[PDB]
Symmetry: C2
């Protein structure tokens, strides 16, 4: 059961604050008193929430601390509401846009926590598919949670199809259809993405961010494409430089797994705990 | 070769005559008196026309009667104008929405002409990628021209990225970026699309048109997916039914090539010529 309920989510939750496809709200459970996040997305007449059942089930069956918890979905008056774990500090992107770059320690802790999440997903034959700062959520306890990509991706595609930015599948051969579902994704792509995310946390944007997307696609698919590096060498330890080097391995056959990466000096070092992020949150609040 | 993107007002060369439905204009060369189509697209500050050079060159280097001719591109006052051969009757979709379904002969002629275009493209190691009624253009002489997909595809993707309906590639592993560029297209996918198109011309919609796109993606990628068929059996010859059967072959390893298809009874029959479409154009105007 994906538990998509046909009732008003306001039956169970009090909306409290718009956090800012659709809208995100901080809300409180009427019975438990739990804070939750409620993501609302408008539905059009040609929409069908039942097509989201697969991605929803993928998220629902996750049982790990580092994956954002799923509490259920609600369909009501052509709005779809997805109820998930509340992470009061927002995404790391939300945070660094005000605090500035993270320390090496803070990044190291974040990477360890993401890797625990990733090792879990990959053990369940799942792939995150979109590791980046905007998808790493932080709660007020300084704990780190991976946000879901799968549901949002399908909603995004439907919008793009509606506006004819991308094609519809009716004329597509099955090989083409398959790729349009599969994508380029293999589990090890998450490792590369984490590597890019570490740079992003260190530098406030991924490599080539100021370059046109189609141009970057052309560049990154060249043979002899040079994997990105941290810009300021002296600022970062040899271990951090090495973490970047190994996660950003071009050949997926040679790119290390999540569990292998949990063995790396950078994320296995003692001292890494949530207090490092509690520091970041204080800086967020009080500068 | 040079893509001939001119930094000049296209009106230095052409008089606009009328809007056809960015915008498409019927236009006339000031010098030769040649009619042309000018396709206009608005550019954002974010935009870089130079990223379109590859797709523009792919179109420019085509030299075949059944591929729409390319005359040049113009960038002016944040508008991109693409100048192409003029096809006065519009697309077959434009046409059948008024006339109703095409006759088997008319379809047979269109398929033969599309197949000549595809054979040419494939021999040049190009793939059309979007065969459908809307991309098959008809001139006043009843001749058949394949419209370009590649340039429009890139513009569409850029818009989708801008609105975050789809993601950017900055965090993608090279495997993932590569697939996003290759998209699962292979030359034989055009053959499948043509089969769907023949049904579309016969029935005014492709198979499953009333079904949600994501659901059709899921259905069309099962191992036991049943390829579509013509709905009305008695209306169509055994030859047409067989044409559908063989073009809609699931495994690309067994699907017939364009030139193999040109040997098929349906399109190799004597009597196929532009007069069949001249009839359709008379029906469009008068009946």
């Amino acid at each position: 059961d994906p538990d998509i309920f046909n009732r008003d989510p306001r039956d169970h939750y009090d909306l409290l604050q718009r956090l800012g496809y659709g809208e995100v709200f901080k809300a409180r459970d009427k019975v438990s008193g739990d804070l939750v996040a409620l993501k609302m997305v408008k539905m059009e007449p040609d929409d069908d929430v039942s097509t989201l059942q697969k991605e929803i089930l993928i998220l629902k069956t996750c049982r790990h601390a580092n994956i954002v918890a799923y509490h259920g979905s609600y369909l009501w008056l052509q709005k779809l509401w997805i109820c998930m774990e509340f992470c009061g500090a927002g995404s790391l992107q939300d945070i660094y846009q005000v605090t500035g770059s993270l320390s090496e320690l803070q990044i190291s802790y974040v990477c360890r926590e993401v890797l625990q999440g990733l090792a879990y997903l990959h053990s369940q034959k799942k792939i995150h598919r979109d590791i980046k700062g905007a998808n790493i959520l932080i709660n007020d306890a300084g704990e780190v949670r991976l946000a879901d990509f799968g549901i949002s991706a399908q909603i995004g595609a439907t919008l793009a199809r509606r506006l004819a930015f991308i094609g519809t599948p009716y004329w597509m051969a099955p090989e083409v259809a398959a790729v349009a579902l599969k994508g380029g994704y293999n589990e090890l792509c998450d490792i590369w993405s984490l590597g890019i995310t570490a740079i992003e946390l260190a530098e406030l944007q991924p490599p080539l961010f100021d370059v046109h997307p189609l141009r970057v696609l052309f560049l990154m698919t060249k043979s002899g494409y040079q994997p990105p590096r941290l810009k300021e060498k002296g600022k970062w330890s040899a271990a951090f430089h090495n973490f970047i080097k190994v996660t950003l391995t071009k050949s997926p056959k040679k790119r290390p797994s999540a569990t292998k990466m949990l063995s790396h000096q950078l994320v296995s070092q003692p001292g890494l705990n949530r207090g490092l992020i509690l520091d970041l949150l204080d800086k967020l609040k009080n500068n």
